[PDB]
Structures are given as structure tokens and as C-alpha cells.
Write an enzyme that holds these catalytic residues in place. Structure first.
Site, PDB file in Angstrom:
ATOM      1  N   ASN A 119      -9.011   4.880   2.926  1.00  0.00           N
ATOM      2  CA  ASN A 119      -9.807   5.814   2.131  1.00  0.00           C
ATOM      3  C   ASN A 119     -10.784   6.738   2.872  1.00  0.00           C
ATOM      4  O   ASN A 119     -11.546   6.318   3.759  1.00  0.00           O
ATOM      5  CB  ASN A 119     -10.512   5.030   1.018  1.00  0.00           C
ATOM      6  CG  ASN A 119     -11.125   5.928  -0.030  1.00  0.00           C
ATOM      7  OD1 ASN A 119     -12.309   6.247   0.034  1.00  0.00           O
ATOM      8  ND2 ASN A 119     -10.320   6.348  -0.995  1.00  0.00           N
ATOM      9  N   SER A 160     -11.855  11.070  -3.586  1.00  0.00           N
ATOM     10  CA  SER A 160     -11.479  10.583  -2.267  1.00  0.00           C
ATOM     11  C   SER A 160      -9.962  10.499  -2.259  1.00  0.00           C
ATOM     12  O   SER A 160      -9.331  10.550  -3.311  1.00  0.00           O
ATOM     13  CB  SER A 160     -12.086   9.197  -1.995  1.00  0.00           C
ATOM     14  OG  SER A 160     -11.508   8.191  -2.810  1.00  0.00           O
ATOM     15  N   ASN A 204      -7.675  10.167  -5.520  1.00  0.00           N
ATOM     16  CA  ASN A 204      -8.340   9.401  -6.561  1.00  0.00           C
ATOM     17  C   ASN A 204      -9.255  10.365  -7.301  1.00  0.00           C
ATOM     18  O   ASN A 204     -10.384  10.619  -6.875  1.00  0.00           O
ATOM     19  CB  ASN A 204      -9.134   8.246  -5.941  1.00  0.00           C
ATOM     20  CG  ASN A 204      -8.255   7.324  -5.110  1.00  0.00           C
ATOM     21  OD1 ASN A 204      -7.358   6.661  -5.639  1.00  0.00           O
ATOM     22  ND2 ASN A 204      -8.475   7.313  -3.793  1.00  0.00           N
ATOM     23  N   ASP A 210     -13.115   9.723  -8.147  1.00  0.00           N
ATOM     24  CA  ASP A 210     -14.216   9.820  -7.204  1.00  0.00           C
ATOM     25  C   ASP A 210     -14.057  10.838  -6.090  1.00  0.00           C
ATOM     26  O   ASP A 210     -14.871  10.888  -5.178  1.00  0.00           O
ATOM     27  CB  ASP A 210     -14.564   8.443  -6.630  1.00  0.00           C
ATOM     28  CG  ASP A 210     -13.635   8.011  -5.512  1.00  0.00           C
ATOM     29  OD1 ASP A 210     -12.470   8.447  -5.455  1.00  0.00           O
ATOM     30  OD2 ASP A 210     -14.098   7.236  -4.665  1.00  0.00           O
ATOM     31  N   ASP A 222      -6.505   8.391  -0.240  1.00  0.00           N
ATOM     32  CA  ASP A 222      -6.031   7.276   0.594  1.00  0.00           C
ATOM     33  C   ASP A 222      -4.935   7.851   1.488  1.00  0.00           C
ATOM     34  O   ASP A 222      -4.048   8.545   0.993  1.00  0.00           O
ATOM     35  CB  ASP A 222      -5.458   6.152  -0.276  1.00  0.00           C
ATOM     36  CG  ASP A 222      -6.500   5.534  -1.186  1.00  0.00           C
ATOM     37  OD1 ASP A 222      -7.643   5.323  -0.749  1.00  0.00           O
ATOM     38  OD2 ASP A 222      -6.160   5.263  -2.344  1.00  0.00           O
ATOM     39  N   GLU A 279       0.799  -1.217   0.000  1.00  0.00           N
ATOM     40  CA  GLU A 279       0.000   0.000   0.000  1.00  0.00           C
ATOM     41  C   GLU A 279       0.831   1.265   0.000  1.00  0.00           C
ATOM     42  O   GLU A 279       0.543   2.182  -0.761  1.00  0.00           O
ATOM     43  CB  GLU A 279      -0.952   0.066   1.197  1.00  0.00           C
ATOM     44  CG  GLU A 279      -2.130  -0.911   1.167  1.00  0.00           C
ATOM     45  CD  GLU A 279      -3.127  -0.657   0.046  1.00  0.00           C
ATOM     46  OE1 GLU A 279      -3.101   0.444  -0.564  1.00  0.00           O
ATOM     47  OE2 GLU A 279      -3.948  -1.573  -0.223  1.00  0.00           O
TER      48      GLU A 279
END
Length: 130
Positions: free
Chosen positions: A60, A51, A46, A49, A53, A35
């Protein structure tokens, strides 16, 4: 902070992650490795959308933490996403445990499905004293 492998393994063990909800320490190591490369300050926006991380586990903002800029988002870990960017990973761990309490468990992270599931993950904890 960018953790060294064994340092992180022991840090996670101290925080109660070994076998949490049936998930071995090596799975958590494999997850953190893929990750973020064991990097607590890693973030990933991102565009598709709106959002982001956050942190070592790339949690998220749509469901887990609040950053105030993600549309119709919730905060299941009830933390500011800022808490997921600390060198001290206690909050990130508390949140990762919250995530796995849901049905999917460790499968919540697609990177775990791609790079850890059904694989020999022993190497992530070998020689760490855990």
C-alpha cells in the site's frame, strides 16, 4: 509478469525470504497467491481512502511506497511505487522485508490472516525444490 508457483518459490528463496524474520517460504507463497495471483503488475485502487496497492504483494501507498497521489502518505520502503510493478521482484521483496520488520510481521496483510494464518500452507511449496 505472472509467476508460475515453483518458479516464484525458488525466486523468493534466492532473494532470502525463507524464514525471514521467522516467516517460512510457504507463508510468503500463500501471501503472494492471495494478494495478486503471483502477478507483479497487479494494482488495486482503494476509493475509500485514496491509496493504491502495488505488485505481487499488493503493498500500500499510504505507508510503504510513494506514488505522489496518496494524501499524507509516507514511503517507508523509500521506493517509487513503480518499483513494485517490475517483473524483477527484488525491490518488492526488499519492501516486503521492511514491512515485516515492524511489530505485526506477516500479519500486516489482512489477506494473510484470512487465507494463510493457522492453515496448512505446505502445498504452496511442494515439489518446488525449496
Amino acid at each position: 509478469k505472472v509467476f508460475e508457483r515453483c518458479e516464484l518459490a525458488r525466486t523468493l528463496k534466492r532473494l532470502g525470504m525463507d524464514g525471514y524474520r521467522g516467516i517460512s517460504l510457504a507463508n510468503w507463497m500463500c501471501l503472494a497467491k492471495w494478494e495478486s495471483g503471483y502477478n507483479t503488475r497487479a494494482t488495486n485502487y482503494n476509493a475509500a481512502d485514496r491509496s493504491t496497492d502495488y505488485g505481487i504483494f499488493q503493498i500500500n501507498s499510504r505507508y510503504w511506497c510513494n506514488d505522489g497521489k496518496t494524501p499524507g502518505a509516507v514511503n517507508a520502503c523509500h521506493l517509487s511505487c513503480s518499483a513494485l510493478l517490475q517483473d524483477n521482484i527484488a525491490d518488492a521483496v526488499a519492501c516486503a522485508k521492511r514491512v515485516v520488520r515492524d511489530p505485526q510481521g506477516i500479519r500486516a496483510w489482512v489477506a494473510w490472516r484470512n487465507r494463510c494464518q493457522n492453515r496448512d500452507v505446505r502445498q504452496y511449496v511442494q515439489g518446488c525444490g525449496v
